[PDB]
Write a protein that binds this ligand. Structure first.
Ligand SMILES: [Mn+2]
Ligand SMILES: [Mn+2]
Length: 181
């Protein structure tokens, strides 16, 4: 059956502005989307989940992901100065003004608990909250505190299911799943 290209998929199935931010992130990292195309789709996916997470509660979150690296640190530093929040060592994805903490969002095709543990071990902060989603509906979050309500998280999981299904229909799912390191 037909095996499509992952680039065609990304440009056809993500919002043009998500695609454009992912292009910038990749350029920022010296990565070529034409060759690392599974990664391009992963970056778009993660951006989109960050935006959906923030949009689940308007004005509650400051968005950090998506910004140019220098601007991202400028915003993290302003938030720390304004709120008294402890400065994180790696750029997080959001800041939650209700619970008063930065959030790292992870999206994975691997087992969620192992990926959660890897993420926690990496940032090593007692303060940054981590919330992981997988493509098959599972999630894991710091202290079993899921931040958003069930319907908000369901909307995100359904979007991830839809991306998986559309990939699989084009023959792209197996390589996308297996490429995560
Ligand atoms: Mn990030
Ligand atoms: Mn993240």
């Amino acid at each position: 059956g037909p095996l499509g290209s992952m680039e065609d998929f990304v440009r056809q199935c993500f919002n043009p502005m998500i695609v454009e931010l992912a292009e910038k992130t990749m350029k920022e990292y010296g990565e070529d989307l034409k060759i690392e195309t599974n990664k391009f789709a992963a970056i778009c996916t993660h951006l989109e989940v960050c935006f959906m997470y923030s949009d689940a509660s308007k004005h509650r979150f400051e968005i950090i992901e998506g910004r140019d690296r220098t601007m991202a640190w400028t915003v993290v530093n302003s938030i720390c100065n304004t709120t008294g929040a402890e400065k994180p060592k790696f750029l997080p994805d959001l800041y939650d003004y209700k619970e008063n903490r930065f959030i790292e969002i992870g999206v994975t095709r691997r087992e969620v608990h192992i990926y959660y543990l890897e993420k926690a071990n990496k940032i090593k902060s007692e303060k940054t909250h981590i919330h992981i989603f997988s493509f098959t509906g599972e999630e894991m979050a710091t202290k079993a505190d899921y931040t958003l309500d069930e319907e908000s998280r369901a909307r995100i999981k359904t979007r991830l299911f839809t991306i998986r299904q559309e990939m699989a229909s084009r023959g792209l799912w197996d390589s996308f799943r297996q490429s995560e390191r």
